[PDB]
Design an enzyme around this catalytic site. Sequence first.
Site, PDB file in Angstrom:
ATOM      1  N   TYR A  27       0.747  -1.248   0.000  1.00  0.00           N
ATOM      2  CA  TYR A  27       0.000   0.000   0.000  1.00  0.00           C
ATOM      3  C   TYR A  27       0.779   1.301   0.000  1.00  0.00           C
ATOM      4  CZ  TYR A  27      -4.141  -2.742   0.341  1.00  0.00           C
ATOM      5  OH  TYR A  27      -5.131  -3.643  -0.009  1.00  0.00           O
ATOM      6  N   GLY A  29       2.706   4.061  -1.459  1.00  0.00           N
ATOM      7  CA  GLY A  29       3.026   4.490  -2.808  1.00  0.00           C
ATOM      8  C   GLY A  29       2.237   3.748  -3.872  1.00  0.00           C
ATOM      9  N   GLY A  31       0.935   0.976  -4.991  1.00  0.00           N
ATOM     10  CA  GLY A  31       0.398  -0.360  -4.786  1.00  0.00           C
ATOM     11  C   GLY A  31      -1.109  -0.257  -4.765  1.00  0.00           C
ATOM     12  N   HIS A  47      -4.023   5.340   5.635  1.00  0.00           N
ATOM     13  CA  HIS A  47      -3.995   6.636   4.967  1.00  0.00           C
ATOM     14  C   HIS A  47      -4.881   6.593   3.710  1.00  0.00           C
ATOM     15  CE1 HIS A  47      -1.992   9.814   2.415  1.00  0.00           C
ATOM     16  NE2 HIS A  47      -2.146  10.478   3.556  1.00  0.00           N
ATOM     17  N   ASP A  48      -4.809   5.500   2.943  1.00  0.00           N
ATOM     18  CA  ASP A  48      -5.636   5.360   1.735  1.00  0.00           C
ATOM     19  C   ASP A  48      -7.104   5.357   2.127  1.00  0.00           C
ATOM     20  OD1 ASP A  48      -3.402   5.130   0.045  1.00  0.00           O
ATOM     21  OD2 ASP A  48      -3.411   2.943   0.089  1.00  0.00           O
ATOM     22  N   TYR A  51      -8.165   8.927   3.017  1.00  0.00           N
ATOM     23  CA  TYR A  51      -8.401   9.753   1.825  1.00  0.00           C
ATOM     24  C   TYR A  51      -9.720   9.356   1.158  1.00  0.00           C
ATOM     25  CZ  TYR A  51      -3.848  12.131   1.088  1.00  0.00           C
ATOM     26  OH  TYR A  51      -2.713  12.886   1.162  1.00  0.00           O
ATOM     27  N   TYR A  64      -3.902  22.477   2.292  1.00  0.00           N
ATOM     28  CA  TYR A  64      -4.423  22.792   3.605  1.00  0.00           C
ATOM     29  C   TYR A  64      -3.441  23.614   4.416  1.00  0.00           C
ATOM     30  CZ  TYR A  64      -1.619  18.497   4.331  1.00  0.00           C
ATOM     31  OH  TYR A  64      -0.598  17.574   4.322  1.00  0.00           O
ATOM     32  N   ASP A  89      -2.974  13.045   6.617  1.00  0.00           N
ATOM     33  CA  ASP A  89      -1.533  13.163   6.416  1.00  0.00           C
ATOM     34  C   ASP A  89      -0.747  13.222   7.722  1.00  0.00           C
ATOM     35  OD1 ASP A  89      -2.079  13.157   3.690  1.00  0.00           O
ATOM     36  OD2 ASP A  89      -1.455  15.225   3.360  1.00  0.00           O
TER      37      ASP A  89
END
Lengths: 122, 122
Positions: A27, A29, A31, A47-48, A51, A64, A89
Amino acid sequence: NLFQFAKMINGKLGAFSVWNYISYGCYCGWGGQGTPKDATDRCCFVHDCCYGRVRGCNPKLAIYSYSFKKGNIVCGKNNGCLRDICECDRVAANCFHQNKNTYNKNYKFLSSSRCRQTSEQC
Amino acid sequence: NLFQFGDMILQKTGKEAVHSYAIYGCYCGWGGQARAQDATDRCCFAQDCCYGRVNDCNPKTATYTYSFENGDIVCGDNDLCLRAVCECDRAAAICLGENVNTYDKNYEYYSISHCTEESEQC
Protein backbone atom coordinates in the site's frame (compact mmCIF):
# COMPACT_ATOMS: atom_id res chain seq x y z
CA ASN A 1 -1.61 17.65 -1.21
CA LEU A 2 1.28 15.24 -1.58
CA PHE A 3 3.80 18.08 -1.57
CA GLN A 4 2.64 18.89 1.96
CA PHE A 5 2.50 15.23 3.03
CA ALA A 6 6.12 14.90 1.82
CA LYS A 7 7.09 17.93 3.92
CA MET A 8 5.42 16.29 6.93
CA ILE A 9 7.32 13.07 6.33
CA ASN A 10 10.69 14.74 5.83
CA GLY A 11 10.08 17.10 8.74
CA LYS A 12 9.36 14.19 11.04
CA LEU A 13 11.81 11.52 9.81
CA GLY A 14 14.54 13.59 8.14
CA ALA A 15 15.62 14.85 4.74
CA PHE A 16 14.89 12.54 1.80
CA SER A 17 12.73 10.23 3.88
CA VAL A 18 9.79 10.62 1.54
CA TRP A 19 11.51 8.66 -1.24
CA ASN A 20 11.42 5.58 0.96
CA TYR A 21 7.64 5.53 0.51
CA ILE A 22 7.37 5.80 -3.28
CA SER A 23 6.81 2.03 -3.48
CA TYR A 24 6.84 -0.11 -0.34
CA GLY A 25 4.75 -3.07 0.68
CA CYS A 26 1.29 -3.48 -0.82
CA TYR A 27 0.00 0.00 0.00
CA CYS A 28 2.77 2.56 0.40
CA GLY A 29 3.03 4.49 -2.81
CA TRP A 30 2.32 2.61 -6.05
CA GLY A 31 0.40 -0.36 -4.79
CA GLY A 32 -3.17 -0.66 -3.62
CA GLN A 33 -4.27 -4.29 -3.22
CA GLY A 34 -3.74 -7.26 -0.96
CA THR A 35 -2.86 -7.36 2.71
CA PRO A 36 -0.61 -4.79 4.45
CA LYS A 37 2.80 -6.48 5.04
CA ASP A 38 3.88 -4.74 8.24
CA ALA A 39 3.27 -1.64 10.37
CA THR A 40 4.55 0.89 7.86
CA ASP A 41 2.45 -0.70 5.13
CA ARG A 42 -0.59 -0.53 7.46
CA CYS A 43 0.07 3.18 8.04
CA CYS A 44 -0.31 3.51 4.26
CA PHE A 45 -3.43 1.36 4.06
CA VAL A 46 -5.08 3.46 6.78
CA HIS A 47 -4.00 6.64 4.97
CA ASP A 48 -5.64 5.36 1.73
CA CYS A 49 -8.83 4.57 3.62
CA CYS A 50 -8.70 8.00 5.22
CA TYR A 51 -8.40 9.75 1.82
CA GLY A 52 -11.25 7.59 0.55
CA ARG A 53 -13.61 9.03 3.15
CA VAL A 54 -12.93 12.61 2.11
CA ARG A 55 -15.86 14.13 0.27
CA GLY A 56 -15.90 17.63 -1.11
CA CYS A 57 -12.36 17.78 -2.38
CA ASN A 58 -9.30 16.18 -3.92
CA PRO A 59 -6.57 14.92 -1.52
CA LYS A 60 -3.94 15.08 -4.28
CA LEU A 61 -4.57 18.74 -5.09
CA ALA A 62 -6.01 20.20 -1.89
CA ILE A 63 -3.73 22.64 -0.10
CA TYR A 64 -4.42 22.79 3.61
CA SER A 65 -3.03 24.78 6.49
CA TYR A 66 -0.51 23.08 8.77
CA SER A 67 2.80 23.72 10.46
CA PHE A 68 5.38 22.11 12.68
CA LYS A 69 5.37 23.48 16.21
CA LYS A 70 8.39 22.36 18.20
CA GLY A 71 8.72 19.17 16.15
CA ASN A 72 5.04 18.24 16.18
CA ILE A 73 2.78 18.41 13.13
CA VAL A 74 -0.24 20.63 13.82
CA CYS A 75 -3.13 20.97 11.40
CA GLY A 76 -4.13 24.63 11.20
CA LYS A 77 -7.37 26.52 10.79
CA ASN A 78 -8.83 24.46 7.96
CA ASN A 79 -12.44 24.42 6.80
CA GLY A 80 -14.38 21.30 5.88
CA CYS A 81 -12.64 18.69 3.76
CA LEU A 82 -9.23 20.42 4.22
CA ARG A 83 -9.27 19.59 7.94
CA ASP A 84 -9.87 15.94 7.11
CA ILE A 85 -7.12 15.72 4.53
CA CYS A 86 -4.58 17.39 6.78
CA GLU A 87 -5.49 14.96 9.56
CA CYS A 88 -5.04 11.96 7.26
CA ASP A 89 -1.53 13.16 6.42
CA ARG A 90 -0.60 14.10 9.98
CA VAL A 91 -1.63 10.71 11.32
CA ALA A 92 0.20 8.86 8.56
CA ALA A 93 3.43 10.85 8.95
CA ASN A 94 3.40 10.23 12.69
CA CYS A 95 2.67 6.57 12.00
CA PHE A 96 5.69 6.33 9.67
CA HIS A 97 7.78 7.89 12.43
CA GLN A 98 6.45 5.55 15.12
CA ASN A 99 7.31 2.58 12.94
CA LYS A 100 10.51 3.86 11.34
CA ASN A 101 12.60 1.16 13.01
CA THR A 102 10.57 -1.64 11.47
CA TYR A 103 11.02 -0.37 7.91
CA ASN A 104 12.03 -3.41 5.82
CA LYS A 105 14.12 -2.54 2.74
CA ASN A 106 13.14 -5.92 1.29
CA TYR A 107 9.59 -4.57 0.90
CA LYS A 108 10.62 -1.79 -1.46
CA PHE A 109 9.45 -1.94 -5.07
CA LEU A 110 7.33 -5.06 -4.72
CA SER A 111 5.59 -6.48 -7.74
CA SER A 112 1.84 -6.84 -7.55
CA SER A 113 2.39 -10.63 -7.47
CA ARG A 114 3.34 -10.23 -3.76
CA CYS A 115 -0.01 -8.58 -3.04
CA ARG A 116 -2.49 -11.09 -4.44
CA GLN A 117 -4.38 -11.64 -1.20
CA THR A 118 -8.02 -10.77 -0.73
CA SER A 119 -7.67 -7.03 -0.36
CA GLU A 120 -8.36 -5.83 3.16
CA GLN A 121 -11.51 -3.79 3.83
CA CYS A 122 -11.43 -0.24 5.21
CA ASN B 1 -5.09 0.65 -8.39
CA LEU B 2 -1.53 1.94 -8.81
CA PHE B 3 0.00 -1.47 -9.54
CA GLN B 4 -2.42 -1.56 -12.47
CA PHE B 5 -1.76 1.99 -13.60
CA GLY B 6 1.95 1.05 -13.46
CA ASP B 7 1.23 -1.87 -15.79
CA MET B 8 -0.58 0.43 -18.24
CA ILE B 9 2.40 2.80 -18.03
CA LEU B 10 4.79 -0.06 -18.77
CA GLN B 11 2.81 -0.99 -21.87
CA LYS B 12 2.52 2.57 -23.19
CA THR B 13 5.87 4.08 -22.19
CA GLY B 14 8.19 1.17 -21.59
CA LYS B 15 9.15 2.65 -18.21
CA GLU B 16 8.76 1.30 -14.69
CA ALA B 17 6.59 3.97 -13.06
CA VAL B 18 8.13 3.51 -9.61
CA HIS B 19 11.55 4.52 -11.01
CA SER B 20 10.30 7.28 -13.27
CA TYR B 21 6.85 8.89 -13.31
CA ALA B 22 6.36 8.22 -9.60
CA ILE B 23 8.92 10.91 -8.77
CA TYR B 24 8.39 13.20 -11.75
CA GLY B 25 7.63 16.90 -11.97
CA CYS B 26 5.02 18.69 -9.94
CA TYR B 27 2.09 16.33 -10.63
CA CYS B 28 3.25 12.86 -11.58
CA GLY B 29 5.15 12.60 -8.29
CA TRP B 30 4.54 13.90 -4.76
CA GLY B 31 3.33 17.33 -5.71
CA GLY B 32 -0.15 18.50 -6.52
CA GLN B 33 0.81 22.18 -6.67
CA ALA B 34 2.81 24.55 -8.82
CA ARG B 35 3.06 24.49 -12.57
CA ALA B 36 2.96 21.29 -14.57
CA GLN B 37 6.46 21.36 -16.01
CA ASP B 38 5.94 19.73 -19.38
CA ALA B 39 3.50 17.55 -21.36
CA THR B 40 4.20 14.46 -19.25
CA ASP B 41 3.47 16.42 -16.06
CA ARG B 42 0.27 17.84 -17.63
CA CYS B 43 -0.93 14.26 -18.28
CA CYS B 44 -0.67 13.61 -14.56
CA PHE B 45 -2.49 16.79 -13.60
CA ALA B 46 -5.32 15.88 -16.00
CA GLN B 47 -5.45 12.46 -14.29
CA ASP B 48 -5.72 14.19 -10.89
CA CYS B 49 -8.76 16.09 -12.19
CA CYS B 50 -10.27 12.88 -13.57
CA TYR B 51 -9.77 11.22 -10.17
CA GLY B 52 -11.34 14.24 -8.50
CA ARG B 53 -14.61 13.33 -10.16
CA VAL B 54 -14.48 9.88 -8.48
CA ASN B 55 -15.95 9.71 -4.97
CA ASP B 56 -17.43 6.27 -4.40
CA CYS B 57 -14.04 4.64 -4.36
CA ASN B 58 -10.44 5.63 -3.90
CA PRO B 59 -8.64 5.46 -7.25
CA LYS B 60 -5.49 4.27 -5.48
CA THR B 61 -7.15 1.08 -4.19
CA ALA B 62 -9.87 0.52 -6.81
CA THR B 63 -8.79 -2.79 -8.36
CA TYR B 64 -10.32 -2.77 -11.79
CA THR B 65 -10.59 -5.00 -14.84
CA TYR B 66 -8.69 -4.05 -17.97
CA SER B 67 -7.15 -5.56 -21.04
CA PHE B 68 -4.88 -4.55 -23.91
CA GLU B 69 -6.38 -5.05 -27.35
CA ASN B 70 -6.19 -3.44 -30.77
CA GLY B 71 -3.55 -1.07 -29.45
CA ASP B 72 -6.08 0.29 -26.95
CA ILE B 73 -6.66 -0.18 -23.24
CA VAL B 74 -10.13 -1.57 -22.63
CA CYS B 75 -11.84 -1.06 -19.27
CA GLY B 76 -14.14 -3.99 -18.66
CA ASP B 77 -15.73 -3.47 -15.27
CA ASN B 78 -19.40 -3.63 -14.60
CA ASP B 79 -18.84 -1.86 -11.24
CA LEU B 80 -19.28 1.87 -11.98
CA CYS B 81 -16.49 3.21 -9.85
CA LEU B 82 -13.95 0.60 -10.94
CA ARG B 83 -14.79 1.46 -14.54
CA ALA B 84 -14.42 5.17 -13.86
CA VAL B 85 -11.00 4.77 -12.27
CA CYS B 86 -9.86 2.50 -15.07
CA GLU B 87 -10.91 5.11 -17.64
CA CYS B 88 -8.88 7.78 -15.81
CA ASP B 89 -5.83 5.51 -15.77
CA ARG B 90 -6.25 4.53 -19.43
CA ALA B 91 -6.36 8.16 -20.54
CA ALA B 92 -3.35 9.03 -18.39
CA ALA B 93 -1.24 6.09 -19.60
CA ILE B 94 -2.06 6.89 -23.24
CA CYS B 95 -1.17 10.54 -22.64
CA LEU B 96 2.13 9.59 -21.00
CA GLY B 97 2.89 7.26 -23.91
CA GLU B 98 2.29 10.09 -26.41
CA ASN B 99 4.86 12.22 -24.59
CA VAL B 100 7.80 10.06 -23.65
CA ASN B 101 9.70 11.80 -26.49
CA THR B 102 9.97 14.79 -24.14
CA TYR B 103 10.42 12.90 -20.86
CA ASP B 104 13.23 14.77 -19.07
CA LYS B 105 15.03 12.92 -16.27
CA ASN B 106 15.90 16.29 -14.75
CA TYR B 107 12.30 16.42 -13.45
CA GLU B 108 12.84 13.31 -11.32
CA TYR B 109 12.84 14.19 -7.58
CA TYR B 110 11.86 17.68 -8.64
CA SER B 111 8.95 18.24 -6.25
CA ILE B 112 11.15 18.47 -3.15
CA SER B 113 12.60 21.88 -3.95
CA HIS B 114 10.31 23.37 -6.60
CA CYS B 115 6.63 23.57 -7.53
CA THR B 116 6.00 26.98 -5.95
CA GLU B 117 4.39 28.65 -8.99
CA GLU B 118 0.68 29.37 -9.30
CA SER B 119 -0.96 25.92 -9.26
CA GLU B 120 -2.81 24.24 -12.10
CA GLN B 121 -6.59 24.24 -11.66
CA CYS B 122 -9.11 21.67 -12.88
